[PDB]
Amino acid sequence: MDAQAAARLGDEIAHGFGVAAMVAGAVAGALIGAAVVAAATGGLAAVILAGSIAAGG
Amino acid sequence: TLYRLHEADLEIPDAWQDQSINIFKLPASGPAREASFVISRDASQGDAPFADYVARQLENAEKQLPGFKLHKRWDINIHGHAAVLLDYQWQREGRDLMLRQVFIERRPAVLITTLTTTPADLPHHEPAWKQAMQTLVPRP
Amino acid sequence: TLYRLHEADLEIPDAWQDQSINIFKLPASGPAREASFVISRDASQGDAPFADYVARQLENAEKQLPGFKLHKRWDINIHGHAAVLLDYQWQREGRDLMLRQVFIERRPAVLITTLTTTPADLPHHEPAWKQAMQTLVPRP
């Protein structure tokens, strides 16, 4: 478990910056889906990147 | 709210808003690279009819996904629930991604299944994807 | 290989890798701000014993989180499953973050619960968190 990411994720979602919070349904699913296909990472890492993707747009 | 997950049950206050995401990575196979299957929830629908909710989802996807291309719209049914199936593609860092997204009307939130692959690899993973969605039973 | 989620049942091939993350945003309450409650899985443990697995988690958290330092640790049993509870503190961009994390031994993957808040706000979110964990019933 990446404590780095669990902390980042838990922090981001607390402040309203989770993926499902900032973009529509279809988009959040699509962003999460791309992150997983793009490293030895896990679900946490994927959800974080989906939010960084969503934020840069 | 008693909340069930694959590995346990636990009670959740109703003031907690759910953003849970099930994620399955389809392993690489032969010529095809790895794909992803994701279950997400969306509680945005409010009072609009379902058919118009999907439209709001389409308009948002065309606006925010770069290189959006719609391939198919399917107004179908899943075990008594109105459903819409979306085949579209968008571009991520020069790579063409082929998406297959299902919106299943439910309260308090729409269930969304999203398969991400490449147009070339889609036919390879369509069997496994077809397997899962035909097995989906929304729970009361 | 049937997969159970709060809203449906479905068959998932075993070749697919589970990376699911349950996510809840805790509402602000009194002087305290919103918190998050996350359930993640980990298959890295392998054959190493829980204690040495839990051991390795702190070693990595202690080098990777700026300003790490450990407040508490429990060793408890949840319905026959060994569990360790950690209260530790770290700073992200100069603001104090507090984590309450429980590792529940299980296979094929260890269950992990993570509550994020601030040292100040932990007492205000603790009652609801206590509700959630006193009800967690693992499946056999």
Numbering used by the authors:
A (entry chain C): 1 to 38, 41 to 59
B (entry chain A), C (entry chain B): 2 to 141
What does the paper say about this structure?
In this structure, two alpha-helices of Tse6 each occupy equivalent Eag binding pockets and run in the opposite direction to match the antiparallel arrangement of the EagT6 dimer. For example, A7 and A30 of Tse6 interact with equivalent sites in their respective chaperone protomers. It should be noted that the modelled conformation of Tse6NT appears to be locked into place by crystal packing, suggesting that in solution Tse6’s prePAAR motif may exhibit significant conformational flexibility and can dissociate from EagT6 as is observed for the prePAAR motif of Rhs1. For example, I22 and I24 of EagT6 create a hydrophobic surface in the ‘palm’ of the claw, which is flanked on either side by symmetrical hydrophobic surfaces comprised of A62, L66, L98, F104, and I113.
One such pathway is the type VI secretion system (T6SS), which in many bacterial species functions to deliver antibacterial effector proteins from the cytoplasm directly into an adjacent bacterial cell via a one-step secretion event. In contrast, DUF1795 proteins, also known as effector-associated gene (Eag) chaperones, interact with so-called ‘evolved’ PAAR proteins in which the PAAR and toxin domains are found as a single polypeptide chain. Crystal structures of Eag chaperones in complex with the TMDs of cognate class I and class II effectors reveal the conformation of effector TMDs prior to their secretion and insertion into target cell membranes. Given that the Eag chaperone dimer creates a hydrophobic environment with complementary knob-hole interactions for its cognate effector TM helices, and interacts with TM helices via side chain to main chain hydrogen bonds, we conclude that Eag chaperones provide an environment that mimics transmembrane helical packing to stabilize prePAAR effector TMDs in the cytoplasm prior to effector export from the cell.
